[PDB]
Structure 1
Amino acid sequence: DIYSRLLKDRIIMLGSAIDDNVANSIVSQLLFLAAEDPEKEISLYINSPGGSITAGMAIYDTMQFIKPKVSTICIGMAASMGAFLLAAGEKGKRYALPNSEVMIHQPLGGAQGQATEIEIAAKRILLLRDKLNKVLAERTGQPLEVIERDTDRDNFKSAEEALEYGLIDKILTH
């Protein structure tokens, strides 16, 4: 397989929408690689439109838990939770290709039923948005009020813009 060879070089490929299965797979690879060599850095390549928040957080928490430093590379597009993980890479090791895109916005969801039930779902998604924004603020260095207004609607950034915002540290060239 073309990916088994990549894994052998400590490269994990997050190249699809994030769901539990994808998350569980990524988490497993992170633990495996960290077990193989807790000192050697790991690289998480990202070309994802994002996905589930809980699955994404599962990946985020594993990246922070393991001893190896996880660098991130934006390939093509890192949107929503994908952009969240890109920004979660070891500071100084967050990369993007010259023409890749990074997009951030707010959590999406739904709720149907009694007022009380809609209330519960609402309180949850608002809590998730606050949690994700607080982390984005911490990771980019931007104030929370800035992250808040900037994620109101789909916010598409170029590699340069992403860098100047604090989502990435460097742009790969040659």
Structure 2
Amino acid sequence: IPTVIAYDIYSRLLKDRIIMLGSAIDDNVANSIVSQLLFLAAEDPEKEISLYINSPGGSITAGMAIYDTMQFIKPKVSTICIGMAASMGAFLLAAGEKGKRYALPNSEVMIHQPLGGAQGQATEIEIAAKRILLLRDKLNKVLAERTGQPLEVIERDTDRDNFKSAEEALEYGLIDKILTHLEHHHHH
């Protein structure tokens, strides 16, 4: 991370209301991104925010932490898929303000059902199964709302890894526009 004069590159971008997510989503990442979101919203609750997304996914709770925040602050959060928006990453992509969900020409998106683990007594394994099946329904329901796709379709399309091109993601309703030029973005 190079320094700008003193800011680290990411911090310099943060200054222009730009948040970069380019790693898997774990508690730390959500924690950092949530603080950044709250900070900006405090700075100016009216000014829009840009969240770049390039991650393989991660913890469902970490993602919902980021998700609920994006929706909770007044600022509208624009999402840009760069590289790959997989699993919870793709979910955050579609979580962006309607009409402000972008991706780049060669961007990729991948949706699929939650993954988990259960170990121990039958009673414990059942508790885990029940919980992960519930999380899948919640996620699916929210995804159907974001994309405009029927719940039944999300369910069926997420059974196994579903990789999509930037065009397909548009077609599916995961993003609103594919950015090509430095002017295609509404920012300028």
Q: With structure 1 as the length reference, what TM-score do the two structures score?
A: 0.99
3-state secondary structure, aligned to 1:102: strand
3-state secondary structure, aligned to 2:13: helix
Q: 1:141 Cα deviation (Å)?
A: 0.2
Structure-2 separation of matches of 1:2 and 1:21: 19
1:134-154: per-residue Cα shift (whole Å, max 9, x none)? 000000000000000000000
Structure-2 separation of matches of 1:65 and 1:113: 38
Gaps of 5+ in 1: none
Q: 1:162 Cα deviation (Å)?
A: 0.1
Structure number with the bigger relative contact order (C-alpha 8 A, sep ≥ 6) is 1
Confirm whether residue 54 of structure 1 aligns to residue 65 of structure 2.
no
CA-based RMSD: 0.9
User: Where in structure 1 do 4 or more consecutive aligned residues deviate above 3 Å?
Assistant: none
Q: 1:93 Cα deviation (Å)?
A: 0.1
Structure-1 separation of matches of 2:93 and 2:51: 8
Q: 1:38 Cα deviation (Å)?
A: 0.3
Structure-1 separation of matches of 2:60 and 2:107: 22
Structure-2 separation of matches of 1:67 and 1:108: 32
3-state secondary structure, aligned to 1:63: helix
Q: 1:88 Cα deviation (Å)?
A: 0.3
Aligned to 1:40: 47
Q: 1:48 Cα deviation (Å)?
A: 0.2
Q: 1:17 Cα deviation (Å)?
A: 0.2
| Aligned residue-pair number | 174
Q: 1:27 Cα deviation (Å)?
A: 0.2
Q: With structure 2 as the length reference, what TM-score do the two structures score?
A: 0.92
Structure-1 separation of matches of 2:131 and 2:61: 12
1:39-88: per-residue Cα shift (whole Å, max 9, x none)? 00001000000000000000000000000000000000000000000000
% identity of equivalent residues:
100
Gaps of 5+ in 2: 1-7, 181-187
Aligned to 1:15: 22
3-state secondary structure, aligned to 2:168: helix
Q: 1:30 Cα deviation (Å)?
A: 0.2
Q: Which has the larger radius of gyration?
A: 2
Structure-2 separation of matches of 1:74 and 1:34: 22
